[PDB]
């Protein structure tokens, strides 16, 4: 869907910005600093689910640019493992949200965050 590599870069950066907001806005809730409304969180995690599937198709070959490290492309398999594993942590977060299980939500939220950082430390430029 991208006319030039720059369009893929802009798309993925925008998608990642939106995940970050839908993930990070729950921090006060998981810390207990803001109240826990199970329905609110269920709905927000559904949005996050949708968004978390979107970036990867915008790292399609030849789309070097942005702050993407080149290693995304020279080992397609390891990067794919990374994103698929991240998405499966999102599945655990969805399960916790759908169950209205706060304890499970806290644990899943931490594991998701660790997954974000694991990818950045291998694949995003400093």
Nearest approach in angstroms of CB 36 to a copy of itself is 16
In DSSP terms, 124 is beta-bridged to 68
115 binds, among ligand HEC, a copy of itself, none (CB under 5 to 8 A by kind): ligand HEC
Give the whole-angstrom CA distance, residue 87 versus residue 125. 22
Give the whole-angstrom CA distance, residue 67 versus residue 85. 21
Q: Which residues contact 29 (CB under 8 A, 6 or more apart)?
A: 35, 36, 41
27-46: which residues touch ligand HEC (CB under 6 A)?
Answer: none
Could you tell me if 65 and 9 are in contact, meaning their C-beta atoms sit under 8 angstroms apart? yes
Binding mask 37-76 for a copy of itself (x = CB under 8 A): ----------x--xx--x----------------------
Q: Token pair for residue 58?
A: 């915008």
| Interface positions with ligand HEC (CB under 6 A) | 9, 12-13, 16-17, 19-20, 23, 66-68, 82-83, 86, 112, 115-116, 119-120, 123-124
Annotated binding site for heme c: 12-13, 67, 116, 119-120
């Amino acid at each position: 869907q991208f006319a030039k590599p720059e369009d893929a870069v802009k798309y993925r950066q925008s998608a990642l910005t939106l995940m970050a907001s839908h993930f990070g806005r729950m921090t006060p809730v998981v810390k207990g600093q803001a109240p826990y409304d199970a329905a609110q969180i269920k709905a927000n995690v559904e949005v996050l689910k949708t968004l978390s599937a979107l970036p990867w198709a915008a790292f399609g070959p030849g789309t070097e640019g942005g702050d993407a490290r080149p290693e995304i492309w020279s080992d397609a398999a390891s990067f794919k493992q990374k994103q698929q594993a991240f998405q499966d942590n999102i599945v655990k977060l969805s399960a916790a949200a759908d169950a209205g299980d706060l304890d499970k939500l806290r644990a899943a939220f931490g594991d998701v965050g660790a997954s974000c950082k694991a990818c950045h430390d291998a694949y995003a430029k400093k």
